[PDB]
Amino acid sequence: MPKKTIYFGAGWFTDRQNKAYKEAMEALKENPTIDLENSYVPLDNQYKGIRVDEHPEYLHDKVWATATYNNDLNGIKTNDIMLGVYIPDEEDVGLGMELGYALSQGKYVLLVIPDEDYGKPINLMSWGVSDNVIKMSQLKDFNFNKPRFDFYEGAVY
Amino acid sequence: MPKKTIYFGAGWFTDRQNKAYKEAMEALKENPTIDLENSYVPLDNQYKGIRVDEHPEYLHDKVWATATYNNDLNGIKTNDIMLGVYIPDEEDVGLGMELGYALSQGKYVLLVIPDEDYGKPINLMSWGVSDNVIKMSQLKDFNFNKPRFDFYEGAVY
Amino acid sequence: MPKKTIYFGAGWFTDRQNKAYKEAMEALKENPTIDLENSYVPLDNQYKGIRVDEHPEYLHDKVWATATYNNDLNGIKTNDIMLGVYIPDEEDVGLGMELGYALSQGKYVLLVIPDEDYGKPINLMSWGVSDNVIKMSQLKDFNFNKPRFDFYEGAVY
Amino acid sequence: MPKKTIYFGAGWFTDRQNKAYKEAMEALKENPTIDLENSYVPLDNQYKGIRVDEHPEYLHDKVWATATYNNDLNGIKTNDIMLGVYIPDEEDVGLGMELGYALSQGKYVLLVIPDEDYGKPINLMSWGVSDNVIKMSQLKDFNFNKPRFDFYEGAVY
Amino acid sequence: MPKKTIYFGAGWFTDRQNKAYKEAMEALKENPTIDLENSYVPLDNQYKGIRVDEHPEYLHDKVWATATYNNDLNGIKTNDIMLGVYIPDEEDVGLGMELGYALSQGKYVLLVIPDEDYGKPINLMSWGVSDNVIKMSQLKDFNFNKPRFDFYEGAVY
Amino acid sequence: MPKKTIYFGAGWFTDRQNKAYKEAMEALKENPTIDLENSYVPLDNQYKGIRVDEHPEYLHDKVWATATYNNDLNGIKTNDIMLGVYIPDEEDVGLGMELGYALSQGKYVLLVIPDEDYGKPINLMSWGVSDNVIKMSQLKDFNFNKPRFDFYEGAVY
Ligand SMILES: Nc1ccnc(=O)[nH]1
Ligand SMILES: Nc1ccnc(=O)[nH]1
Ligand SMILES: Nc1ccnc(=O)[nH]1
Q: Is 3.50.50.60 the CATH classification of the domain at E2-157?
A: no
Query: Within 10 Å of residue A28's Cβ, how many Cβ atoms?
Result: 22
Spell out which chain F residues touch chain D, with contact meaning CB-CB distance below 8 angstroms. 35, 38, 45, 63, 67, 70-71, 73-74, 77-78, 105-106
What distance separates the 2 farthest-apart alpha carbons in chain E? Answer: 46
* Nearest one of F151, B157, B149, B89 to A65, comparing CA atoms: B157
Chain A hits for F80, Cβ within 8 Å = 78
At D98 the three-state DSSP class reads: helix
Least Cα separation, residue E125 to chain B (angstroms): 23
Report the distance separating Cα C125 and Cα C123, nearest Å.
5
* Nearest one of A138, A93, A114 to A17, comparing CA atoms: A114
Considering only CA atoms, which residue is closest to atom 7 of ligand 2?
A: D42
At D27 the three-state DSSP class reads: helix
> Ligand 3 centre and the CA of B124: distance in Å?
40
Query: Within 10 Å of residue E116's Cβ, how many Cβ atoms?
Result: 12
CB E65 within 8 A of CB F128: yes
* Nearest one of C142, C70, C68, C69 to C111, comparing CA atoms: C142
* Nearest one of F92, C145, C87, D100 to E94, comparing CA atoms: F92
**For chain F, how big is the Rg over CA atoms in Å?**
15
Chain E hits for B79, Cβ within 8 Å = none
Report the distance separating Cα E93 and Cα E82, nearest Å.
16
Chain D hits for B62, Cβ within 8 Å = 63, 66
Report the distance separating Cα D45 and Cα D41, nearest Å.
6
- For the beta sheet containing A81-85, the strands, ordered from the edge strand earlier in sequence to the opposite edge, are A6-10, A81-85, A108-113, A132-135
Report the distance separating Cα C95 and Cα C92, nearest Å.
5
Query: Within 10 Å of residue D12's Cβ, how many Cβ atoms?
Result: 14
Q: Which residues partner with F133 through β-bridges? A: F111
What was the elucidation method? X-ray
Amino acid identity, residue D103? L
Residues in chain A: 157
> Ligand 3 centre and the CA of F48: distance in Å?
13
Which residues of C does the annotation mark as catalytic? 98
**C146/B70 touch (CB, cutoff 8 Å), yes or no:** no
CB C78 within 8 A of CB C4: no
CB D103 within 8 A of CB D83: no
Report the distance separating Cα B114 and Cα E109, nearest Å.
39
* Nearest one of D133, D157, F60, E126 to C64, comparing CA atoms: D157
- Residues contacting residue C71 through CB under 8 Å, at least 6 positions apart: C42, C45, C47, E148, E149
Crossing angle between the packed helical segments F93-104 and F62-77, to the nearest 10 degrees = 50
Considering only CA atoms, which residue is closest to atom 7 of ligand 1?
A: A42
At B71 the three-state DSSP class reads: helix
* Nearest one of F29, F49, F36 to F7, comparing CA atoms: F36
F100: left (phi over 0), alpha (psi -120 to 50) or beta: alpha
* Nearest one of D108, D154, D114 to D132, comparing CA atoms: D108
The answer to whether the CB of D75 is under 6 A from ligand 2 is no
Considering only CA atoms, which residue is closest to atom 1 of ligand 1?
A: B157
> Ligand 2 centre and the CA of D92: distance in Å?
11
Report the distance separating Cα D148 and Cα D131, nearest Å.
7
Report the distance separating Cα A151 and Cα F44, nearest Å.
47
At D10 the three-state DSSP class reads: strand
- Give the dihedral sign, CA D139/D142/D147/D150: negative
Phi, psi (degrees; rounded to nearest 5) at B65: -65, -40
CB D130 within 8 A of CB C33: no
Report the distance separating Cα F74 and Cα F70, nearest Å.
6
Report the distance separating Cα D67 and Cα D76, nearest Å.
14
Pairing of strands B108-113, A6-10: unpaired
Report the distance separating Cα F145 and Cα F147, nearest Å.
6
Dihedral angle, C-alpha B10, B15, B16, B22, nearest 10 °? 60
Give the ligand with the smallest distance to the CA of F67.
3
Report the distance separating Cα A84 and Cα A113, nearest Å.
9
Cα angle value C138/C139/C142 (rounded, 5°): 85
Which residues of E does the annotation mark as catalytic? 98
- Residues contacting residue B81 through CB under 8 Å, at least 6 positions apart: B4, B5, B6, B7, B107, B108, B110, B144, B147
* Nearest one of F40, F28, F112, F35 to F73, comparing CA atoms: F40
Q: Which atom of ligand 2 is nearest to the CA of D71?
A: 7
Residue of D nearest to A149 (CA): D71
Of the CA atoms within 13 Å of residue A106, those in its CB half-sphere come to 22
Query: Within 10 Å of residue A82's Cβ, how many Cβ atoms?
Result: 28
- Residues contacting residue E14 through CB under 8 Å, at least 6 positions apart: E87, E90
Report the distance separating Cα E11 and Cα D148, nearest Å.
35
Q: How many helices (H) and strands (E) does chain B have?
A: 4, 4
